[PDB]
Design a protein around this ligand. Structure first.
Ligand SMILES: CCCCCCCC/C=C\CCCCCCCC(=O)N[C@@H](COP(=O)(O)OCC[N+](C)(C)C)[C@@H](O)/C=C/CCCCCCCCCCCCC
Ligand SMILES: *[C@@H]1O[C@H](CO)[C@@H](O)[C@H](O)[C@H]1NC(C)=O
Lengths: 273, 104
């Protein structure tokens, strides 16, 4: 599962911003340098099976299509009813062992998408998206190249890369956990917070417990990224100030091999005497 | 249309006075991508703050991770300050750390 995202911000006809990045599964592997027009490799295995000459062509292909896209947008902006400032987002990729996609958004809403061999407008995006597909489909040879980038070049990039860097995606990193008081509780209530930090991969199990009974009031937060490549999660439980006894947090993770982390609401947390 | 950012603050390790740590501010679900995020130490802006490359979710809303290395003490308060076109005023979200039991 590899895909590439574009973030093109058009503040006016003379001011632009282009942010490009490539993602293996969920690990950013590439970045575009607007200056020098170069694909920046984030890891020694970002280039994969491909040689310097093939990357020079890939940089040139993305160089030509980017210059052609930004110029075509500003040429047809009035006809397309694109009112400054606006933002266009693109995401496209593939995966096998199969699927392929390429989607474009205008002002953060579905606008057009690529289907097999041409650009189809999203019907809700109206006439301006049909006008956009008229300009995107003006050259069928370019749509054939776009097809092969998705169906052929993209799965080939996974091969020489998802095998070379396969070890990192299967790395097992044990979590750490701790307990704390939460803010904003109801009157006469407490918010018990169980933090789980530094685990990999993403799937994780965490519940407040009363012995062996799972506490179904457990509110599991969003899994948040950490810049070291691991994940973070908060699980909160709101309890009446007296009923906070015998409570514990239990964490299950593939890296622990059944040896769950169990922390007890105890000590200065209660607090004891 | 526009979407207001969600702001979530967390430390990488449990808070321990005198031990280096990492403070994180994860901002997500906003549109457009133009946003100003600051990490605050006792109300003043922290220089040398890293942030991840801009990205977006399936619904096209943007997200970012701001982080810096830090060492908490007994007195320091930490927070995340975010300004966005959807906000009337900059929203400040505190880092919720537990300094232990109060009464000695
Ligand atoms: C950095 C990491 C790189 C790592 C890669 C290494 C492994 C590669 C493996 C898989 C990658 C494959 C998956 C991605 C497939 C990509 C599909 C693709 O190339 N799309 C192109 C098609 O443009 P055309 O050449 O057809 O038409 C040009 C204009 N005509 C009408 C004027 C002539 C276009 O949409 C995007 C251009 C770049 C975006 C920048 C601009 C933002 C606005 C974009 C739209 C503006 C439209 C303007 C219309 C006037
Ligand atoms: C890279 O491609 C070559 C063929 O061009 C092949 O010999 C090799 O096994 C591939 N993978 C590597 C070198 O990791």
């Amino acid at each position: 599962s590899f895909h590439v995202i574009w973030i093109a911000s058009f503040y006016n006809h003379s001011w632009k911003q282009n942010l490009v990045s490539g993602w293996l599964s969920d690990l950013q592997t590439h970045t575009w340098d607007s200056n020098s027009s170069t694909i920046v490799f984030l890891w020694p295995w970002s280039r994969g099976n491909f040689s310097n000459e093939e990357w020079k062509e890939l940089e040139t292909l993305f160089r030509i299509r980017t210059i052609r896209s930004f110029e075509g947008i500003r040429r047809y902006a009035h006809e397309l009813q694109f009112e400054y400032p606006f933002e266009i987002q693109v995401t496209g990729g593939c995966e096998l062992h199969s699927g392929s996609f390429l989607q474009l958004a205008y002002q953060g809403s579905d606008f057009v998408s690529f289907q097999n061999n041409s650009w189809l407008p999203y019907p809700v995006a109206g006439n301006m998206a049909k006008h956009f597909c008229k300009v995107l489909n003006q050259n069928q040879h370019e749509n054939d190249i776009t097809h092969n980038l998705l169906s052929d070049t993209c799965p080939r990039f996974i091969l020489g890369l998802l095998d070379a860097g396969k070890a990192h995606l299967q790395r097992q990193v044990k979590p750490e956990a701790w307990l704390s008081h939460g803010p904003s509780p109801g009157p006469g209530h407490l918010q018990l917070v169980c933090h789980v930090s530094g685990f990999y991969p993403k799937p994780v199990w965490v519940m407040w417990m009363r012995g062996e009974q799972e506490q179904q009031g457990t509110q599991r937060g969003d899994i948040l990224p950490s810049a070291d490549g691991t994940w973070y999660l908060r699980a909160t439980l709101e309890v009446a100030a007296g009923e906070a006894a015998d409570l514990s947090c239990r964490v299950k993770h593939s890296s622990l091999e059944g040896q769950d982390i169990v922390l007890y609401w105890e000590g200065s947390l209660v607090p004891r005497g | 249309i526009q979407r207001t950012p969600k702001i979530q603050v967390y430390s990488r390790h449990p808070a321990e006075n005198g031990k280096s740590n990492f403070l994180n501010c994860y901002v997500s679900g906003f549109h457009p991508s133009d946003i100003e995020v600051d990490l605050l130490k006792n109300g003043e802006r922290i220089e040398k703050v890293e942030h991840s490359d801009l990205s977006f979710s399936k619904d096209w809303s943007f997200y970012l991770l701001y982080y810096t290395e830090f060492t908490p003490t007994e007195k320091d308060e930490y927070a995340c300050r975010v300004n966005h076109v959807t906000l009337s005023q900059p929203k400040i979200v505190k880092w919720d750390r537990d300094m232990g039991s109060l009464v000695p």
